[PDB]
Amino acid sequence: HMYDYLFKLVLIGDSGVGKSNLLSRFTKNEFNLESKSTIGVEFATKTTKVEGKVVKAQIWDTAGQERAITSAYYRGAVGALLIYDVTRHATFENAARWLRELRGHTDPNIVVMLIGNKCDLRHLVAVKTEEAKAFAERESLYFMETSALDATNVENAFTEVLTQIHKIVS
Template sequence: MSKQFQFKLVLLGESAVGKSSLVLRFVKDQFDDYRESTIGAAFLTQTVSLEDGTSVKFEIWDTAGQERYKAPMYYRNANCAVVVYDITQSASLEKARSWIRELQRQADPSIIIALCGNKSDLSARRQVSQEEAKKYAEEEGLMWGETSAKSGEGVQDIFTDIAKKLPKSAPPSARTAGGRTATGARQGVDLNKQANATGGQGEQCNC
């Protein structure tokens, strides 16, 4: 039986950069030109199967971009974050930088952060060069990629790359109750073990 792990992923970024469209493309392979802005946060799940036989189930929190919703509750205990900017709006990259600074200050130190430039299908209107974004990501130790929620280009890749980078286990001495290490970092939940312990019924993740 292949191993299955569960991780909490949060999407952050300014309004209208396409966070909800990115999730819709990833989860349902759909795109809606007239999608309304998210209010608060939306919750979805999607599973990625990896070449090594493991699978990663993402619990995805798609947050609103408005400042009044900028609260740690959405990224508390998050294992990974996708911070999205719009390649046609240079101001959205500056906003993404502020989100990343907040994650670096407030989130778990082990969180994996991916900087994502969305709307690559609008490259003729590009204001943020790949070189600028990639250089910033390298300086901050972030993953980086460009996507188009509209065409689907790069969407699966960025989530799969995150899934590959997430820790699938922790040293036995570091494990503690609740799926956390001794340092407080949340580890992936092994869904196979949960199913065995509960007679085949999966447990709700305490996120």
């Protein structure tokens, strides 16, 4: 293989938090203004040079609501983005219930990052950054605020994960 490492990452979080757009903004630098709820499981790939070595991230992406294929979706996942909508406090509370789901199906030592998405909708921010920092520290998660719409921190969040995974694995 051309790459040194192949890291399977999963995106989870409630419907409409922007998971699919985060991905397409990372892989294909596009903001899908015309997005729609995801059917089944979609995939995407990116090959990066962190460390001076070749990393092929393999990103799985599924919808938020109504399963049983939870099974294959999480299996072998080695990093995860836990994404909530910065303007809808309901999506941020459900993060712990996603975190239990994610944890019942992965190794305790995967790299997990909490993402607060849509940080551009600044006048509707309904979740205090400090409260999300609280949940992140309480649960040993990484933490970022992102905007898929204006690319803010999207690259930083994904690479950060991928670097943190390699340090475990070397």
